[PDB]
Amino acid sequence: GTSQWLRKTVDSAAVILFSKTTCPYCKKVKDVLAEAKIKHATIELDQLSNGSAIQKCLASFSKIETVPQMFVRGKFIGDSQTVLKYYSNDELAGIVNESKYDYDLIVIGGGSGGLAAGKEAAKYGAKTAVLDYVEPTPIGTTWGLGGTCVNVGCIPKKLMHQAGLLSHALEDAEHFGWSLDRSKISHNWSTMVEGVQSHIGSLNWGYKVALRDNQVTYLNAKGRLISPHEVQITDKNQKVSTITGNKIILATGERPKYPEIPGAVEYGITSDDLFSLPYFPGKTLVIGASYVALECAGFLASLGGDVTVMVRSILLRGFDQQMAEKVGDYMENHGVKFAKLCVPDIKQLKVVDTENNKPGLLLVKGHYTDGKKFEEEFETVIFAVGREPQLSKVLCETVGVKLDKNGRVVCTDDEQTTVSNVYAIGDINAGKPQLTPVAIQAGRYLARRLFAGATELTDYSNVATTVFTPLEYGACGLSEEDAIEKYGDKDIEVYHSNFKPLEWTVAHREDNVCYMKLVCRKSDNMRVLGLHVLGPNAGEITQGYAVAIKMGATKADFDRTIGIHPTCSETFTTLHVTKKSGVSPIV
Amino acid sequence: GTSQWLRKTVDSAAVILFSKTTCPYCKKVKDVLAEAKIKHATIELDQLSNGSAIQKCLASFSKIETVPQMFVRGKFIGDSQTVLKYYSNDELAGIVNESKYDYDLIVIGGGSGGLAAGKEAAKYGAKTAVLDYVEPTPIGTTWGLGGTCVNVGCIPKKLMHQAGLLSHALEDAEHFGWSLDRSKISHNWSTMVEGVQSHIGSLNWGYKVALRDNQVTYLNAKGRLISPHEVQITDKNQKVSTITGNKIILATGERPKYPEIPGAVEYGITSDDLFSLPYFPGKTLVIGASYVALECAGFLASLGGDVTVMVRSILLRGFDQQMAEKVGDYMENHGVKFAKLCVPDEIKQLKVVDTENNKPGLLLVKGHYTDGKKFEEFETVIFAVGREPQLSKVLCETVGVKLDKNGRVVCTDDEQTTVSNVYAIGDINAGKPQLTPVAIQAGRYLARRLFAGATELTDYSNVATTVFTPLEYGACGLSEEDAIEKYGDKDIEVYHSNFKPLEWTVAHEDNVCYMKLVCRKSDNMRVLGLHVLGPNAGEITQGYAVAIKMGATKADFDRTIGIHPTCSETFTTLHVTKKSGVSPIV
Ligand SMILES: Cc1cc2nc3c(=O)[nH]c(=O)nc-3n(C[C@H](O)[C@H](O)[C@H](O)COP(=O)(O)OP(=O)(O)OC[C@H]3O[C@@H](n4cnc5c(N)ncnc54)[C@H](O)[C@@H]3O)c2cc1C
Ligand SMILES: Cc1cc2nc3c(=O)[nH]c(=O)nc-3n(C[C@H](O)[C@H](O)[C@H](O)COP(=O)(O)OP(=O)(O)OC[C@H]3O[C@@H](n4cnc5c(N)ncnc54)[C@H](O)[C@@H]3O)c2cc1C
Ligand SMILES: COC(=O)N1CCN(c2ccc(F)cc2)CC1
Ligand SMILES: COC(=O)N1CCN(c2ccc(F)cc2)CC1
Ligand SMILES: COC(=O)N1CCN(c2ccc(F)cc2)CC1
């Protein structure tokens, strides 16, 4: 138990010192290591409940039971006198740097999870390399270090959402007494894209500075695992070479899919292209119905565009469908058009005017599920029909890393693959929520287990979400239909209410469009299984409740907690109308 | 135990039916009731663990052990055959309206707590009266039903705050690509006030409709408790009369204080006057440093006002003082002036308010700093120097209701006063947080205990707050200095971080928003207090109040995953401690 933890900790830590807080010889060694700029993990035995047992077990590697003890890459180096001997004879630097491999850790992929992993490992003395490369889109779009969220994901899309929200702030200002006239105000796409891209640029640079200041080697190159410890790299000049590493973290993410139809790749674009597009898209068709499709359609319409969404079957498959229909109804009432139960079968009418900074012109032909036809012209067509990894680019099949039927990596609950020294984090880890804070937590927690003797695992259950559509939708836990399927309708009670933000009263906005509900389990003390809210600032509302749901909140916990007034969130503390009762939820 | 609960429930319930969910005789009685429109409480014995014991105990009142049993005001009325007998003989209506008193419940005060209590009691058949009167301010201001929050508190102040927030939204819009020019846009005070007051009017009307639809008698009259069961009322024609009630709820609230200096009452105003003022205040002095003082100075500045705040000692006394200083520093950097360590001595009138042309007057303010140096013109002077009840106005001293040294009512943990049928809720309940949602919870829970046999008490601990200053401040639990005083500095660990809202990046400050968790080392790093300075701070704070109620630790925050991109997610990854000395900047 303790013995197996200690053996695992010693074998994989790069440089680790076993210590006690009260020990003067330990402080002498800490100071030497600090002077020579040798980074290392430290385990203070007096601060652990079984530190006495650990102390005795150390003798199985060192033949001594005393403290301090210093190890490098699985080898006992010495006690106080011996470490200082090596320091005085200028032998220490060579001892702590000798390794069977070029790196203690190679991270393939410089995005949300990979950068978090690599930085955290280097803190504990692991010699670390992070590899990142951005394969260009079909039209040639590329970007800098930081991954999908930073460059073509959460960051630009929420900034563009904020630009859309400010349109309603302009309308509301007149009712609150400000003298502007919203009717005579227009939006400039390229001005906003320039501001968004300058912020993304500051993030690209910040990550390069962070890696430098943690002594992490950054290679802007494509990585390919050719055996358990060997990574083949290809640089911007297509120069090929090989580097070796003890532990390997795969963190290469996904890219957008295109449907297999004529004209899609040639004449459409994806979210990869939209966030740096040099011209306003114009009249736009969005194909798909995921959160990416609806978020992009939403801000495009708020910025004055003529927007249509083509929906194969339902909106937001896998989310609570009552909430998904309320989201879509709001968008349709506020200027988004929908072509429902429809799929595309794309012709070019005009080439993109790269001179005068203007889109082209396209003819889209499709059909509905009953057989009727769709035919209409658009200036821009955006495909948002899912994302996929392409691990054949990354991972030679002879290495032995097992994939599932979707091409994602099959992992243990500590992110280990079928190859003992290789791990996977983020969007390519099969079965896990595909979110940036999940990738960051998995990467940091893994680095600590590998190089600092930590034990804590990442918890992937009940991870909260928010969809940043024009009216936002936050959620934590089960949808209502999944709860009913798992426990039966008679064991589920749902409390719900409409509400109206105080900010919407003077502005003459809608009375009964915002909505929230708690999905509860009767036979388990009215345990809250899922929380759902449609309204402004839905992510800020939802976050804090995710802590309560993690700790097992019941309806009675929500009832005994007092509201903050006036807020939207306080409506969760006084819910009382049940769905079974038939009483209206309106306000 | 069970017997003492049943005796208490039967004695004070107005109309109550003991019943079982599967009981056709019970269901037949339920139909006769409210076919005759008779409202009542119901207790389903098959849904309680000690329901068997309760059933046997009923026989001590009725001499029977079966269900249904109907009671009216402590008297057994009958089983199924007997109730139906009274119904078809037209004797039932008189039975259920028989009372020693005019009302089962009289509520003195029609605000947050009192309206909540009154509506809830009426749901279970209590014959209920709610009394409300608004004593005019020194300049004559008055308003409608609903209390301080609705008319001159949370509701108008947050709407004016939103008007102020929209100024920076107009600024931000240009950076996000919108073509407007903020420097050419101005604000019209009277247009704002008209919209705020139209919303307040819809609330006044909605409460009158709510009381009508619940069969509550609304008397627009001033009430005075003259004996345990007698309330003297004075109407708007100064006609005096007396009504009697079984239970009495005192819910009369507080009003603003003035300092005892020349010219204060005659020439200054308070928050009671500000929210319906027909002219813009102009150059304004706010005297005080409470949340009311800072919230009002903050939105006046954002709407284009020249505003100064006179601070006697510190900002937000009773709140975490690191947080209070950051709130004030932000205000001073964004155009609020502060006269620190200063108090007023006298207000002189230089011009009378110009009610024709709808303009303020002009005043000379004289005061002094704590070292003796002198302070010496403003168009408006607003006093925000605290609030107080005035129960020697509501409550004759011979009734026997005990007050504390501040004049608030000393209550048990079930809101009972020293007079057994008299209760108090809301701001006048000594020692309790003075907040609208607390008063509502206290009033509703009390009505259920009086008239439906409920047992649940209101929990007043760890109630979250938000100060709606220009940059908002939310909190739940102890301040850092209070935690250190209670447990010692070596048992307290503070995790903290600055942050920048993503919305602020394209809009161009980096390190002004701030958050911290104050934790107890020897209790598994229990979260004692949570604090956040930033946009939407009340929306951020609310959900965490549930987790703190359940006893959240630092480990609970760590294992919960963030939502990205939000401000709130910074709470899920905090790691810099104050003891480490590492900078919290980002
Ligand atoms: C439009 C959009 C909006 C989103 N909005 C949100 C949101 O609001 N909130 C949220 O939580 N999540 C959001 N997400 C999801 C979030 O972006 C991902 O979950 C997250 O980026 C995944 O992190 P990762 O480390 O797994 O991969 P990535 O961040 O994709 O990083 C992987 C990196 O590795 C590189 N790479 C690939 N192959 C190789 C190779 N062979 N050699 C070297 N480098 C390679 C890739 O080019 C990329 O740079 C959004 C996603 C999209 C597409
Ligand atoms: C400027 C300001 C801003 C505030 N902002 C907030 C905020 O954002 N959030 C929050 O939670 N709280 C806020 N509060 C506090 C909140 O208003 C009070 O806590 C709450 O209104 C108290 O409710 P109550 O029922 O105790 O009394 P009140 O709401 O004051 O109601 C008492 C009523 O009884 C009437 N009355 C008095 N004497 C008699 C009598 N003899 N006969 C009949 N009627 C009588 C009074 O005129 C009044 O109408 C604010 C307060 C102020 C002053
Ligand atoms: C077909 O040849 C390849 O395998 N390549 C092409 C060159 N790539 C690259 C790497 C880094 C960079 F900055 C720009 C481009 C990597 C993959
Ligand atoms: C000094 O004489 C009093 O006791 N008064 C005067 C009349 N007041 C009143 C009541 C209701 C109303 F709508 C307007 C005014 C009550 C208090
Ligand atoms: C201390 O000042 C702030 O925090 N401000 C900055 C601007 N923000 C805002 C508010 C409403 C809106 F519609 C658009 C932007 C938030 C409030």
Is A294 annotated to bind a ligand? Reply is: yes
Q: Tell me how far apart the alpha carbons of residues B418 and A423 are, in angstroms, rounded to a whole number.
A: 69
Residue contact A149–B503, C-beta within 8 A: no
CB B548 within 8 A of CB B461: no
Q: Kindly list the residues from chain B whose CB atom is less than 8 angstroms away from the CB atom of residue A170.
A: 169-170, 173, 178, 180
Burial call A267-292: b when 16+ CB within 10 Å, e when fewer: bbbbbbbbbbbebbbbbbbbbbbbbb
Q: Tell me how far apart the alpha carbons of residues A234 and A222 are, in angstroms, rounded to a whole number.
A: 5
Cβ burial, residue B199 (10 Å; 0-12/13-18/19+): middle
In this structure, which ligand is nearest to the CA of B469? 5
Q: Look up tokens 């008490």; give the residue.
A: B457
Give span(s): CATH 3.50.50.60, chain B: 103-161+190-256+388-451, 264-385
State the nearest Cα–Cα gap between A185 and chain B, in angstroms.
6
Task: Tell which residue, B90, B101, B100, B41, has the closest CA to residue B70.
Answer: B41
Q: Tell me how far apart the alpha carbons of residues A224 and A204 are, in angstroms, rounded to a whole number.
A: 23
Taking phi over 0 as left and psi of -120 to 50 as alpha, with beta for the rest, A503 belongs to: alpha
Which pair of structure tokens corresponds to residue B271?
A: 């928050």
Q: Tell me how far apart the alpha carbons of residues B446 and B423 are, in angstroms, rounded to a whole number.
A: 9
- Amino acid of residue B121: A
CA–centroid distance, residue A208 to ligand 1 (Å):
17
Give residues with Cβ within 8 angstroms of B517, minimum separation 6. Answer: B494, B495, B496, B527, B529, B530, B531, B554, B557, B571, B574
Which pair of structure tokens corresponds to residue B150?
A: 């609705």
Q: Which long-range contacts (CB under 8 A, 24 or more apart) does A426-430 make?
A: A426/A109, A426/A111, A426/A112, A426/A113, A426/A114, A426/A251, A426/A253, A427/A148, A427/A253, A427/A254, A427/A387, A427/A389, A428/A250, A428/A251, A428/A252, A428/A253, A428/A254, A428/A389, A428/A391, A430/A403, A430/A404, A430/A406
Is A293 annotated to bind a ligand? Reply is: yes
Give the side-chain half-sphere CA count within 13 A for B33. Answer: 25
Phi, psi of A538 (to 5 degrees): -65, -30
- Amino acid of residue A92: L
Q: Could you tell me where the DSSP H helices lie in B233-290?
A: 264-267, 271-274
Give span(s): CATH 3.50.50.60, chain A: 264-385
CATH 3.40.50.300 is held by the domain A2-97: no
Cβ burial, residue B479 (10 Å; 0-12/13-18/19+): buried
Q: CA torsion B193→B198→B203→B209, rounded to 10°?
A: 160
Q: Could you tell me where the DSSP H helices lie in B36-109?
A: 51-62, 80-88, 92-96
Task: Tell which residue, B490, B584, B477, B562, has the closest CA to residue B527.
Answer: B477
Three-state secondary structure of B197-233: HHHHHHHHHHHHHHHHHCCCEEECCEEEEEECCEEEE
Tell whether A560 lies on the interface with B, counting CB pairs under 8 A. Answer: yes
In Å, how far are A84, A377, B295 from B316, measured between CA atoms?
56, 61, 11
In this structure, which ligand is nearest to the CA of A238? 3
CB B502 within 8 A of CB B356: no
Q: Tell me how far apart the alpha carbons of residues B466 and A373 are, in angstroms, rounded to a whole number.
A: 56
In Å, how far are A276, A503, B186, B303, B535 from B163, measured between CA atoms?
34, 9, 12, 8, 15
Q: Kindly list the residues from chain A whose CB atom is less than 8 angstroms away from the CB atom of residue B175.
A: 195
In three-state secondary structure terms, B478 is coil
Give residues with Cβ within 8 angstroms of B512, minimum separation 6. Answer: B326, B330, B471, B498, B533
Task: Tell which residue, B586, B546, B545, has the closest CA to residue B567.
Answer: B586
CB B147 within 8 A of CB B474: no
**Secondary element (H or E) of residue A207:** helix A189-213
Restricting to B residues 160-199, those with a Cβ less than 8 Å away from any Cβ of A are: 162-163, 166-167, 169-170, 172-173, 175-180, 185-189, 191-192, 195-196, 199
Residue B73: count other Cβ atoms within 10 Å of its Cβ: 22
A69-72 and B374-375 beta bridge pairing: unpaired
CB B506 within 8 A of CB B556: no
CA–centroid distance, residue A277 to ligand 1 (Å):
19
Residue contact A438–B561, C-beta within 8 A: yes
Q: Look up tokens 């939802």; give the residue.
A: A542
**Secondary element (H or E) of residue A164:** helix A154-175
CB B451 within 8 A of CB B12: yes
Task: Classify the C-alpha dihedral A393-A399-A401-A407 as positive or negative.
Answer: positive
CB B513 within 8 A of CB B485: no
Query: B127 in ligand 4 pocket by Cβ < 6 Å?
Result: no
Residue to test with chain B: of A562, A568, A574, most B Cβ within 10 A:
A562
Q: Tell me how far apart the alpha carbons of residues B12 and B422 are, in angstroms, rounded to a whole number.
A: 13
DSSP state of A579: S
Task: Tell which residue, A170, A382, A355, has the closest CA to residue A282.
Answer: A382
CB A51 within 8 A of CB A76: no
Task: Tell which residue, A422, A4, A452, has the closest CA to residue A225.
Answer: A422
* Substitution candidate for ligand 5 out of B172, B506, B539 with most atoms within 8 A of CB: B172
Restricting to A residues 482-511, those with a Cβ less than 8 Å away from any Cβ of B are: 502-503, 505-506
Q: Tell me how far apart the alpha carbons of residues B153 and A566 are, in angstroms, rounded to a whole number.
A: 11
Q: Tell me how far apart the alpha carbons of residues A203 and A145 are, in angstroms, rounded to a whole number.
A: 8
Q: Tell me how far apart the alpha carbons of residues B122 and B99 are, in angstroms, rounded to a whole number.
A: 16
Q: How many residues does chain B have?
A: 586
In B370-420, beta strands by DSSP E: 374-375, 380-383, 387-388
CB B352 within 8 A of CB B360: no
Give residues with Cβ within 8 angstroms of A447, minimum separation 6. Answer: A105, A116, A117, A118, A120, A121, A123, A124, A126
Q: Look up tokens 């002594």; give the residue.
A: A215
DSSP B483-548: HHHHH-GGGEEEEEEEE--GGGTTT---S-EEEEEEEEGGGTTEEEEEEEESTTHHHHHHHHHHHH
State the nearest Cα–Cα gap between A523 and chain B, in angstroms.
14
Task: Tell which residue, B276, B296, B273, has the closest CA to residue B285.
Answer: B296
Burial call B131-141: b when 16+ CB within 10 Å, e when fewer: bbbbeebeeeb
Task: Give chain B's end-to-end CA distance (angstroms, integer).
Answer: 59
Residue B343: count other Cβ atoms within 10 Å of its Cβ: 18
Give residues with Cβ within 8 angstroms of A167, minimum separation 6. Answer: A182, A187, A302, A303, B178
> Given A166, A551, A561, which is nearest B545 (Cβ)?
A561
Q: Look up tokens 């968008």; give the residue.
A: A331
CB B146 within 8 A of CB B281: no
> Given A186, A459, A547, which is nearest B552 (Cβ)?
A547
Task: Tell which residue, A493, A501, A20, A318, has the closest CA to residue B199.
Answer: A501
Q: Tell me how far apart the alpha carbons of residues A295 and A276 are, in angstroms, rounded to a whole number.
A: 16
In three-state secondary structure terms, B242 is strand
Angle (nearest 5°) at CA B400 between B398 and B403:
115
Which pair of structure tokens corresponds to residue B82?
A: 């007997």
Restricting to B residues 412-451, those with a Cβ less than 8 Å away from any Cβ of A are: 435-438, 441
In Å, how far are A273, A358, A444, A534, B167 from A278, measured between CA atoms?
10, 9, 36, 33, 30
Q: Which long-range contacts (CB under 8 A, 24 or more apart) does B179-184 make?
A: B179/A185, B179/A186, B179/A187, B179/A188, B180/A170, B180/A180, B180/A185
Architecture of domain B472-573: 2-Layer Sandwich (3.30)
Is A291 annotated to bind a ligand? Reply is: yes
Task: Tell which residue, A337, A367, A364, A332, has the closest CA to residue A348.
Answer: A364
Residue B259: asked if its preceding bond is cis (omega within 30°), the reply is no
Query: B99 in ligand 4 pocket by Cβ < 6 Å?
Result: no
CATH 3.40.50.1110 is held by the domain B103-161+190-256+388-451: no
Q: Whose CA is nearest to atom 10 of ligand 3?
A: A236
CB B539 within 8 A of CB B523: no
Query: B221 in ligand 4 pocket by Cβ < 6 Å?
Result: yes
Give residues with Cβ within 8 angstroms of B395, minimum separation 6. Answer: B224, B225, B250, B401
Closest atom of ligand 2 relative to the B146 alpha carbon? 49
CB B79 within 8 A of CB B64: yes
Q: Look up tokens 């009923």; give the residue.
A: B58
Three-state secondary structure of A78-90: ECHHHHHHHHHCC
Task: Classify the C-alpha dihedral B395-B397-B400-B406 as positive or negative.
Answer: positive
Q: Tell me how far apart the alpha carbons of residues A310 and A388 are, in angstroms, rounded to a whole number.
A: 21
Give residues with Cβ within 8 angstroms of B77, minimum separation 6. Answer: B70, B71, B83, B86, B95, B96
Beta-bridge partner residues of B108: B131, B250
3-state helix, strand, coil in chain A (%, to 5): 40, 25, 40
How many helices (H) and strands (E) chain A has is answered by: 18, 26
Phi, psi of A106 (to 5 degrees): -115, 125
Is A427 annotated to bind a ligand? Reply is: yes
Task: Tell which residue, B43, B48, B54, has the closest CA to residue B16.
Answer: B43
CB A136 within 8 A of CB A265: no
Which pair of structure tokens corresponds to residue B555?
A: 């480990």
In Å, how far are A579, B124, B460 from B444, measured between CA atoms?
22, 12, 14
Q: Whose CA is nearest to atom 10 of ligand 4?
A: B236
In Å, how far are A459, B72, B471 from B92, measured between CA atoms?
62, 11, 61
CB A527 within 8 A of CB A546: no
Give residues with Cβ within 8 angstroms of A448, minimum separation 6. Answer: A120, A124, A454, A456
In A188-239, beta strands by DSSP E: 217-219, 222-227, 230-234
Q: Tell me how far apart the alpha carbons of residues A552 and A462 are, in angstroms, rounded to a whole number.
A: 11
Q: Tell me how far apart the alpha carbons of residues B399 and B482 are, in angstroms, rounded to a whole number.
A: 38
**Which chain B residue has the Cα nearest residue A156?**
B502
Phi, psi of B106 (to 5 degrees): -115, 125
Query: B256 in ligand 2 pocket by Cβ < 6 Å?
Result: no
Task: Tell which residue, A122, A110, A109, has the closest CA to residue A214.
Answer: A122
Q: Tell me how far apart the alpha carbons of residues A441 and A335 are, in angstroms, rounded to a whole number.
A: 38
Residue contact B149–A565, C-beta within 8 A: yes
Q: Kindly list the residues from chain B whose CB atom is less than 8 angstroms away from the CB atom of residue A156.
A: none
- Amino acid of residue A351: V
Restricting to A residues 103-162, those with a Cβ less than 8 Å away from any Cβ of B are: 149, 154-155, 158-159, 162
* Substitution candidate for ligand 2 out of A502, A565, A569, A574 with most atoms within 8 A of CB: A565
Distance, CA of A539 to chain centre: 15
Residue A241: count other Cβ atoms within 10 Å of its Cβ: 11
- Most distant CA pair in chain B, distance: 86
Residue B480: count other Cβ atoms within 10 Å of its Cβ: 21
**Secondary element (H or E) of residue B286:** strand B284-287
Query: A237 in ligand 3 pocket by Cβ < 6 Å?
Result: no
- Amino acid of residue A75: K
Task: Tell which residue, B76, B59, B60, has the closest CA to residue B13.
Answer: B76
Query: B535 in ligand 5 pocket by Cβ < 6 Å?
Result: yes
Query: Does the active-site annotation cover A576?
Result: no
Q: Kindly list the residues from chain B whose CB atom is less than 8 angstroms away from the CB atom of residue A558.
A: 546
In A15-95, beta strands by DSSP E: 15-19, 41-44, 69-72, 75-78
Q: Look up tokens 């003077």; give the residue.
A: A506
The CATH class for the domain spanning B264-385 reads: alpha beta
> Given B187, B541, B571, which is nearest A564 (Cβ)?
B541
- Amino acid of residue B323: M
In three-state secondary structure terms, B424 is strand
CB A409 within 8 A of CB A391: yes
Q: Tell me how far apart the alpha carbons of residues A153 and A439 are, in angstroms, rounded to a whole number.
A: 14
DSSP state of A403: B
Q: Tell me how far apart the alpha carbons of residues A585 and B518 are, in angstroms, rounded to a whole number.
A: 39
Give residues with Cβ within 8 angstroms of B343, minimum separation 6. Answer: B310, B312, B367, B368
DSSP A72-120: ETTEEEE-HHHHHHHHHTT-HHHHHH--SSSEEEEEE--SHHHHHHHHH
Give span(s): CATH 3.30.390.30, chain A: 472-573
Q: Tell me how far apart the alpha carbons of residues B556 and A479 are, in angstroms, rounded to a whole number.
A: 23
* Substitution candidate for ligand 2 out of B385, B393, B436 with most atoms within 8 A of CB: B436
CB B2 within 8 A of CB B53: yes
Annotated catalytic residues of B are 564
CB A107 within 8 A of CB A96: no
Q: Look up tokens 């994989």; give the residue.
A: A12
Architecture of domain B2-96: 3-Layer(aba) Sandwich (3.40)
Sheet holding A307-311, edge to edge: A337-340, A307-311, A284-287, A380-383
Q: Tell me how far apart the alpha carbons of residues A276 and A144 are, in angstroms, rounded to a whole number.
A: 12
Which pair of structure tokens corresponds to residue B569?
A: 């997610």
Query: A224 in ligand 3 pocket by Cβ < 6 Å?
Result: no
For this experimental structure, what is the resolution in angstroms? 1.8
Q: Tell me how far apart the alpha carbons of residues A20 and A42 are, in angstroms, rounded to a whole number.
A: 9
A15-19 and A41-44 beta bridge pairing: parallel
Q: Tell me how far apart the alpha carbons of residues A83 and A30 are, in angstroms, rounded to a whole number.
A: 10
CB A109 within 8 A of CB A135: no
Q: CA torsion A235→A236→A240→A246, rounded to 10°?
A: 0
Which pair of structure tokens corresponds to residue A205?
A: 């640079």
Residue contact B563–A569, C-beta within 8 A: no
Q: CA torsion B135→B136→B137→B141, rounded to 10°?
A: 140
